[PDB]
PDB file of C-alpha atoms in Angstrom:
ATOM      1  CA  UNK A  13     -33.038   2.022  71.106  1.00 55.44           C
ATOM      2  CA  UNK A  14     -33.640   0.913  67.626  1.00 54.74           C
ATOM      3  CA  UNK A  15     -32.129  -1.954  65.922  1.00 54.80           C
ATOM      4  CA  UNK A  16     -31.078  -1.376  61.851  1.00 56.00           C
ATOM      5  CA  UNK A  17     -32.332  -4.275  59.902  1.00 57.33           C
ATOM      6  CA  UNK A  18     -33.418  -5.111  56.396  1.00 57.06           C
ATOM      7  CA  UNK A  19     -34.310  -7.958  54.316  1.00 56.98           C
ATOM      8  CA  UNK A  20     -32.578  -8.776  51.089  1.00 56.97           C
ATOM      9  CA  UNK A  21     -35.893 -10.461  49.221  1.00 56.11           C
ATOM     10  CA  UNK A  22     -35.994 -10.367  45.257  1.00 56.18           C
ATOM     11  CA  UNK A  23     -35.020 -12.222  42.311  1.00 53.85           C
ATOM     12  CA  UNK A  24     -34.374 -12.141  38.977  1.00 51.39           C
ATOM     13  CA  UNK A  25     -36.092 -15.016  37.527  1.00 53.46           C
ATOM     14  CA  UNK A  26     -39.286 -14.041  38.231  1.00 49.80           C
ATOM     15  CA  UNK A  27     -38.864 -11.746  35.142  1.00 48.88           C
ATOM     16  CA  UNK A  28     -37.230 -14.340  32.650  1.00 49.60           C
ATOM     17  CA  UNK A  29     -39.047 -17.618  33.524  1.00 48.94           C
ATOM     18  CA  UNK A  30     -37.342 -18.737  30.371  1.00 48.56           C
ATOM     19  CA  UNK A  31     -34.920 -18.674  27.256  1.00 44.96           C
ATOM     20  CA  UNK A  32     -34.266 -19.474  23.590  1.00 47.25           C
ATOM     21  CA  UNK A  33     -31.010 -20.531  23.761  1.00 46.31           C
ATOM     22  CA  UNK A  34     -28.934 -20.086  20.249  1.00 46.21           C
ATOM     23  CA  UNK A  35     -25.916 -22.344  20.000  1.00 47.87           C
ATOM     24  CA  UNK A  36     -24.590 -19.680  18.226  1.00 49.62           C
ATOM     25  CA  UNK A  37     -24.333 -16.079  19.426  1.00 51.04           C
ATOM     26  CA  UNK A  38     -26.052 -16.399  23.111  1.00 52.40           C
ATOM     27  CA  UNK A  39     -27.082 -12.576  23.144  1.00 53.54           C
ATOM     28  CA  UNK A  40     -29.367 -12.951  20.799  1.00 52.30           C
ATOM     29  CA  UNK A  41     -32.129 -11.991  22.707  1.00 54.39           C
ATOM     30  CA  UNK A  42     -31.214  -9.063  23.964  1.00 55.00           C
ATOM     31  CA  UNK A  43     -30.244  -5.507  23.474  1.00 60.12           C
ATOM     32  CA  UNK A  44     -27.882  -2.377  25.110  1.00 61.93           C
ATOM     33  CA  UNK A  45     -29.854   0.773  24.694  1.00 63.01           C
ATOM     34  CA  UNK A  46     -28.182   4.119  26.774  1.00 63.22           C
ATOM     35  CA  UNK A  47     -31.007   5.020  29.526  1.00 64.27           C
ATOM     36  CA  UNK A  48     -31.172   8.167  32.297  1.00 64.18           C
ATOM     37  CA  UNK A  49     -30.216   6.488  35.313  1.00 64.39           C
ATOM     38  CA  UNK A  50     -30.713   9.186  37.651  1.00 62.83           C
ATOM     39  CA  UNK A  51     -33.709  11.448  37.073  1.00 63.30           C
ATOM     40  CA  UNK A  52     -32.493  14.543  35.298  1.00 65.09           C
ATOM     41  CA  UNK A  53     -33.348  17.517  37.758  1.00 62.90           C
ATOM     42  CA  UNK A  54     -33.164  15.790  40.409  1.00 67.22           C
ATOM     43  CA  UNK A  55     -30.231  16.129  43.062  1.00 67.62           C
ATOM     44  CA  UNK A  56     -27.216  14.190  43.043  1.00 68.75           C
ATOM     45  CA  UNK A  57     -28.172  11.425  45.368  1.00 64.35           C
ATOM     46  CA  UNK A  58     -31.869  10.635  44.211  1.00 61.16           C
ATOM     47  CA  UNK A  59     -31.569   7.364  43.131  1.00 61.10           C
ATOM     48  CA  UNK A  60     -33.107   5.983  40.034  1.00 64.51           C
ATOM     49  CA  UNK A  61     -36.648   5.594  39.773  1.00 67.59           C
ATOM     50  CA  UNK A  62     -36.477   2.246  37.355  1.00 67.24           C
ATOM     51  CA  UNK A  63     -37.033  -1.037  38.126  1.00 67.21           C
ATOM     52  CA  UNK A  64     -36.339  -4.563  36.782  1.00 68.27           C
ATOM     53  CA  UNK A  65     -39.411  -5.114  34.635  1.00 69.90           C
ATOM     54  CA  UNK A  66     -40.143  -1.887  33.396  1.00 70.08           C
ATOM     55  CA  UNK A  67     -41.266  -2.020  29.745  1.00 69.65           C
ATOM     56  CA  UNK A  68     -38.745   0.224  27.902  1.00 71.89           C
ATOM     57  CA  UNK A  69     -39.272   1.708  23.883  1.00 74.38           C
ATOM     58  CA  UNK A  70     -36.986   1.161  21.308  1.00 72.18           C
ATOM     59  CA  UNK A  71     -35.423   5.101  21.758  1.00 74.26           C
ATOM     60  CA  UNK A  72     -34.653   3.536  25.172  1.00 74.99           C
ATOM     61  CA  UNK A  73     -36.909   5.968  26.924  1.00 70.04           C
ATOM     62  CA  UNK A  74     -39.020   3.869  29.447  1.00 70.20           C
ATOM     63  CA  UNK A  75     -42.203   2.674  28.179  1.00 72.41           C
ATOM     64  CA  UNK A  76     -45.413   4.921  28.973  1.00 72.31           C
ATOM     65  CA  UNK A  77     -48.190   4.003  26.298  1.00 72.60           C
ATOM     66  CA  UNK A  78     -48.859  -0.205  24.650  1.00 72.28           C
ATOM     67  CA  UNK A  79     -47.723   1.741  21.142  1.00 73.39           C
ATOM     68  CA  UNK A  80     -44.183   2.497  22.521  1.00 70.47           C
ATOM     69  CA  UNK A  81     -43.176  -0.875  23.774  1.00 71.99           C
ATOM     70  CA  UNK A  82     -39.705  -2.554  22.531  1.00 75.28           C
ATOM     71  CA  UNK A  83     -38.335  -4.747  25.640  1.00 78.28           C
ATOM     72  CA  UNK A  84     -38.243  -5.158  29.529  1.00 78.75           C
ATOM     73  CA  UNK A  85     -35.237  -4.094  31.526  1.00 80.47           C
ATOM     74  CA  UNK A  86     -33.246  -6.857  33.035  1.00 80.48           C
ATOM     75  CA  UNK A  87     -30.439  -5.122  33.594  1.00 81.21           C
ATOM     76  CA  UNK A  88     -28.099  -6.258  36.056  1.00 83.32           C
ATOM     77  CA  UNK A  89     -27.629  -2.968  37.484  1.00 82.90           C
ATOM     78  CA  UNK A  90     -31.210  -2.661  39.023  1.00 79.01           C
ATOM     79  CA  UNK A  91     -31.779  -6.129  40.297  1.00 79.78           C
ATOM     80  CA  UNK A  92     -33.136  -6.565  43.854  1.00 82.27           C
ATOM     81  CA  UNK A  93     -30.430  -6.698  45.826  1.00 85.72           C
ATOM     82  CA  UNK A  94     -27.388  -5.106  44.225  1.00 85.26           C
ATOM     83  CA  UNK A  95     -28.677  -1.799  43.737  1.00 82.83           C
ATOM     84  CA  UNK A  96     -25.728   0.000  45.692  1.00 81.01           C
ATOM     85  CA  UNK A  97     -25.636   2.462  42.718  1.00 84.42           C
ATOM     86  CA  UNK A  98     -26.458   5.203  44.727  1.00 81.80           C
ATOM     87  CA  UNK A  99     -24.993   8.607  44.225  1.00 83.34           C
ATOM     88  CA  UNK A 100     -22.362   7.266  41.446  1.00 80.71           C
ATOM     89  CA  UNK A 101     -24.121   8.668  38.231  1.00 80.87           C
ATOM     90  CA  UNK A 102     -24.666  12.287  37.695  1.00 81.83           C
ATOM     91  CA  UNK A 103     -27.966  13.798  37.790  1.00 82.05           C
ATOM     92  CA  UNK A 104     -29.192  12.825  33.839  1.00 79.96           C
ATOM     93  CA  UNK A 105     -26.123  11.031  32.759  1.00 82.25           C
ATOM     94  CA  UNK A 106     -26.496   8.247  30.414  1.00 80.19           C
ATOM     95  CA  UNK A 107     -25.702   4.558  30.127  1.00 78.98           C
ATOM     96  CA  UNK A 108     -25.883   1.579  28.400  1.00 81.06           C
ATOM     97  CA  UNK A 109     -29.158  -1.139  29.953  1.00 78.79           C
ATOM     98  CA  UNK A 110     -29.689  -4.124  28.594  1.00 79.95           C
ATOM     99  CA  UNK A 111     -33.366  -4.965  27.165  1.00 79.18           C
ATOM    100  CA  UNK A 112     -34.772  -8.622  27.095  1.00 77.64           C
ATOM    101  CA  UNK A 113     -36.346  -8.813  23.342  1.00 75.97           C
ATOM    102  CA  UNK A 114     -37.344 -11.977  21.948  1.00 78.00           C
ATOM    103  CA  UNK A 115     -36.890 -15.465  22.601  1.00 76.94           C
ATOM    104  CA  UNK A 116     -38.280 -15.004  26.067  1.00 75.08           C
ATOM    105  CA  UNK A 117     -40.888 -16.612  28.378  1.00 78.26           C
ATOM    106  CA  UNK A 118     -41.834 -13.777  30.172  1.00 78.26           C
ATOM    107  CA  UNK A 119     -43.906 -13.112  33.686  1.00 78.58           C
ATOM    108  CA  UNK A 120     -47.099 -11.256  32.904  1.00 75.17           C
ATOM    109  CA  UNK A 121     -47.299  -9.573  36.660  1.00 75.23           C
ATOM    110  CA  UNK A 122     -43.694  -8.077  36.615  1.00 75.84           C
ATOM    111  CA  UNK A 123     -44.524  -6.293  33.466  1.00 76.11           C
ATOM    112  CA  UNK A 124     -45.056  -2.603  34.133  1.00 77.76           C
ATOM    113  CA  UNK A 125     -44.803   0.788  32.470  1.00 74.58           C
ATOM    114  CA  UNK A 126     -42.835   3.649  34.049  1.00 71.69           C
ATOM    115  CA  UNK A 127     -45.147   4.361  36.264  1.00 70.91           C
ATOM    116  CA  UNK A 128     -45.748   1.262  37.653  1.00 71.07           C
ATOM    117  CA  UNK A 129     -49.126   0.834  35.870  1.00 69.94           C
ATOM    118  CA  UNK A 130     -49.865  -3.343  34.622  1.00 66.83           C
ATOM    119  CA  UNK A 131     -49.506  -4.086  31.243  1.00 67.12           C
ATOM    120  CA  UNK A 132     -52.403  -4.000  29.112  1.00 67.29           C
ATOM    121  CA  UNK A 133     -53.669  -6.314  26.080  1.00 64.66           C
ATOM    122  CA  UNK A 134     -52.369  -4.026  23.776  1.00 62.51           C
ATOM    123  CA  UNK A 135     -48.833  -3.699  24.962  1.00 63.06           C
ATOM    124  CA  UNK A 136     -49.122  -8.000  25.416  1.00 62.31           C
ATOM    125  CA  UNK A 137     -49.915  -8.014  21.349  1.00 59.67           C
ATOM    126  CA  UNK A 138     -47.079  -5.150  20.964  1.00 59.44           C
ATOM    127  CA  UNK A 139     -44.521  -7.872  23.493  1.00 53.37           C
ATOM    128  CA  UNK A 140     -45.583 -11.037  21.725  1.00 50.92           C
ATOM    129  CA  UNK A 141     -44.889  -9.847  17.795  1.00 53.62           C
ATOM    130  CA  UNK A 142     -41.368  -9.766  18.762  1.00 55.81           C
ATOM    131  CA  UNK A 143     -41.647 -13.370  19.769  1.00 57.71           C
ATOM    132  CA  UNK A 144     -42.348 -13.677  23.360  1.00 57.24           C
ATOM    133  CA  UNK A 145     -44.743 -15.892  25.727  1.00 53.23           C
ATOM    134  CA  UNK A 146     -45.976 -13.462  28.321  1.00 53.13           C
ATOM    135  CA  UNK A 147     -46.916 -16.209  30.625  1.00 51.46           C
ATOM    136  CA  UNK A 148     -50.048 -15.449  32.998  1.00 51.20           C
ATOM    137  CA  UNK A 149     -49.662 -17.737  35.795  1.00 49.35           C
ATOM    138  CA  UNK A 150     -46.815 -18.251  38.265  1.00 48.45           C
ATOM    139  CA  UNK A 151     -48.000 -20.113  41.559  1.00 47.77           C
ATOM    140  CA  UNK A 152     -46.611 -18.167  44.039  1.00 47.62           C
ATOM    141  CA  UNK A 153     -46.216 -18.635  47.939  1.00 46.54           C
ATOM    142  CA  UNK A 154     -47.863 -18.295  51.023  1.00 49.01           C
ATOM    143  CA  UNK A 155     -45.182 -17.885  53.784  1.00 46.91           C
ATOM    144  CA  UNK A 156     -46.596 -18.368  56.935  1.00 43.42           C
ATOM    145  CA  UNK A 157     -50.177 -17.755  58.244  1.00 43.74           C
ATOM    146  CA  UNK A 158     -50.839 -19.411  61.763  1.00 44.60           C
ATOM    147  CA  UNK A 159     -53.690 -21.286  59.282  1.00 42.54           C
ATOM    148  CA  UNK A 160     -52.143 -21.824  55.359  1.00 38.92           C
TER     149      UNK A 160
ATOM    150  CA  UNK B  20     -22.295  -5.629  29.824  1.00 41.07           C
ATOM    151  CA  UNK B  21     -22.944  -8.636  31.696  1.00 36.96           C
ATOM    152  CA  UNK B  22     -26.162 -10.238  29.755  1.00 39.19           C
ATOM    153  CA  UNK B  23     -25.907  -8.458  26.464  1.00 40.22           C
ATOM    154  CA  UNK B  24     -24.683  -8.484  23.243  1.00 41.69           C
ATOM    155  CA  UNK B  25     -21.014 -10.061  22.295  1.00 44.44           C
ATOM    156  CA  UNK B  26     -18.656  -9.340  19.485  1.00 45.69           C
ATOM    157  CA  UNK B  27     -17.123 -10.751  16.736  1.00 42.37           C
ATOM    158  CA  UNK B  28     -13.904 -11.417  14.561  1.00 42.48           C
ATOM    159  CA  UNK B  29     -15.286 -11.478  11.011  1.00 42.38           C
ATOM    160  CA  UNK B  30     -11.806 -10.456   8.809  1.00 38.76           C
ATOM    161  CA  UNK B  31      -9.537 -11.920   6.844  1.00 37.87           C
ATOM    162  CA  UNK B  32      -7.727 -11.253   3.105  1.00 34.02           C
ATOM    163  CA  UNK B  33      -5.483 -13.327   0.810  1.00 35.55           C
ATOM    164  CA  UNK B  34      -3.390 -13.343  -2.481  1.00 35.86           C
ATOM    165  CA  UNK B  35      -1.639 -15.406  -4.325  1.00 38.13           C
ATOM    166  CA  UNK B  36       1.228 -14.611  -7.181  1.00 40.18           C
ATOM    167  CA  UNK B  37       2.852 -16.276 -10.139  1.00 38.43           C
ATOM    168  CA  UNK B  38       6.221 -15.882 -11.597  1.00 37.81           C
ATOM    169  CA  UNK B  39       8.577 -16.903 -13.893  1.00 37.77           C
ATOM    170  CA  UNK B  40      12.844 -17.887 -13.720  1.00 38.25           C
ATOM    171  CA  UNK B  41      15.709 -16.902 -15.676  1.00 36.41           C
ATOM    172  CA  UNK B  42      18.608 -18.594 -16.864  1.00 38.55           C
ATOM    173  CA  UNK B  43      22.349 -18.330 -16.633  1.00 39.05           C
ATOM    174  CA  UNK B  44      24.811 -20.939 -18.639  1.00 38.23           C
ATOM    175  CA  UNK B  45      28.328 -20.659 -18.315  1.00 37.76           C
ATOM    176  CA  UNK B  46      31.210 -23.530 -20.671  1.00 40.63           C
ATOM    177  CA  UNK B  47      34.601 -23.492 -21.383  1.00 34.78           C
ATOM    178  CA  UNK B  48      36.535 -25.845 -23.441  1.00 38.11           C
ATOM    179  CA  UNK B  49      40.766 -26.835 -23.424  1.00 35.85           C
ATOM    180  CA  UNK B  50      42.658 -27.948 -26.507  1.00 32.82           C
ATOM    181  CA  UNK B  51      45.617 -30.066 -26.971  1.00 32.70           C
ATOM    182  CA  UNK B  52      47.550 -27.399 -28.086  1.00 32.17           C
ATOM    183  CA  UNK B  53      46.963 -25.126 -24.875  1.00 31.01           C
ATOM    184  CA  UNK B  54      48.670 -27.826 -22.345  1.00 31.43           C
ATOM    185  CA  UNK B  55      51.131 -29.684 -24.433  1.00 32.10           C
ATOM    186  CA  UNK B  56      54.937 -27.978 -24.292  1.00 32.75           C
ATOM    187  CA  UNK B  57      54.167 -25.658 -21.882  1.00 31.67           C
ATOM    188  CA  UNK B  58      55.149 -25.052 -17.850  1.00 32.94           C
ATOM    189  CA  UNK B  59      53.219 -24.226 -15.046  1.00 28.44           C
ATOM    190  CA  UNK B  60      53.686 -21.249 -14.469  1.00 30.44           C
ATOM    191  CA  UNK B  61      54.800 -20.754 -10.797  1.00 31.09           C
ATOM    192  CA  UNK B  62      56.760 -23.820 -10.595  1.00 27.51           C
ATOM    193  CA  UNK B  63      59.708 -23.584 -13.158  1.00 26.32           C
ATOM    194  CA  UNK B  64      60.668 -26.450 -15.067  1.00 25.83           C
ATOM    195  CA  UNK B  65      58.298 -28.953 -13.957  1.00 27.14           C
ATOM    196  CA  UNK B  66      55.907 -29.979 -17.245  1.00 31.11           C
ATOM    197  CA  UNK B  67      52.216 -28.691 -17.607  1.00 31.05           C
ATOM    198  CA  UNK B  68      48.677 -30.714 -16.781  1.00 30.88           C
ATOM    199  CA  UNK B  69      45.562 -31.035 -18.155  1.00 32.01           C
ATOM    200  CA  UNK B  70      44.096 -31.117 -14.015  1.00 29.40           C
ATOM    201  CA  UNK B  71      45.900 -27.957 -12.882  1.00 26.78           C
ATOM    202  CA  UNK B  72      44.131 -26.101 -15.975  1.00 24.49           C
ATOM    203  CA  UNK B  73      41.105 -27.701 -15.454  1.00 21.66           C
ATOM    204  CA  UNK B  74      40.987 -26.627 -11.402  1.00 25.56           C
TER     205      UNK B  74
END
């Protein structure tokens, strides 16, 4: 026998450690750009391959070289946690994400291109013109070693 | 989407007019000689008065 669990770890402020806050229009610091949810030959249960923290151009095509760096995907639609969007979008189909842009204090570690590689010092100059404080140090945790 | 962008009412239009208003008199005068010796009309014999004309 073989009991089913999971674990439901994540969160979303690791990416956005912090804000700019405008007491006038509140979105100000972000942007909806239409994205490929699921990949476009794929079948029509392969879930989508992006992940919250993925740096993302301005054509809204997820990030692959420093040069074509715009934002970072915080959508709410690929959080840890939530992503039950599984088989709902046709294989290609488009739809709106919404990109973090300026006004942001960033986590340096969560920043990744599309696939999966760190961000480099270039695409940390590229980040930072828009405005942004890509933060290098978060403390982190040590759970639970018999020792520390 | 919940996160992004809002939107906004930015509209709006006026006017404003000026004109001008005509003007209508009306006057009417009574004589002596209109009232004096004369009836009422609907009643016979009985004498004429200046406040029936003027009504």
């Amino acid at each position: 026998a073989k009991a089913h669990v999971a674990t439901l770890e994540g969160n979303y402020s690791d990416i956005v450690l912090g804000r700019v806050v405008a007491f006038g229009d509140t979105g100000w610091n972000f942007k909806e750009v239409d994205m490929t949810f699921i990949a476009d030959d794929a079948d029509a249960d392969s879930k989508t391959t992006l992940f919250a923290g993925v740096l993302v151009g301005e054509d809204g095509t997820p990030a692959t070289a420093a040069a074509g760096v715009f934002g970072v995907l915080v959508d709410r639609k690929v959080l840890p946690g939530v992503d039950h969007y599984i088989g709902v979008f046709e294989p290609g189909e488009k739809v709106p994400m919404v990109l973090a842009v300026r006004g942001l204090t960033l986590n340096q570690l969560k920043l990744k291109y599309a696939d999966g590689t760190a961000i480099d010092a270039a695409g940390i100059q590229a980040l930072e013109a828009q405005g942004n404080q890509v933060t290098d140090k978060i403390v982190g945790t040590q759970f639970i070693g018999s020792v520390l | 989407q919940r996160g992004g962008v809002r939107q906004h009412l930015a509209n709006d239009r006026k006017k404003i007019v000026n004109l001008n208003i005509p003007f209508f008199p009306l006057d009417r005068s009574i004589d002596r000689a209109d009232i004096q010796n004369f009836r009422e009309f609907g009643t016979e014999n009985a004498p004429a008065t200046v406040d029936a004309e003027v009504q």
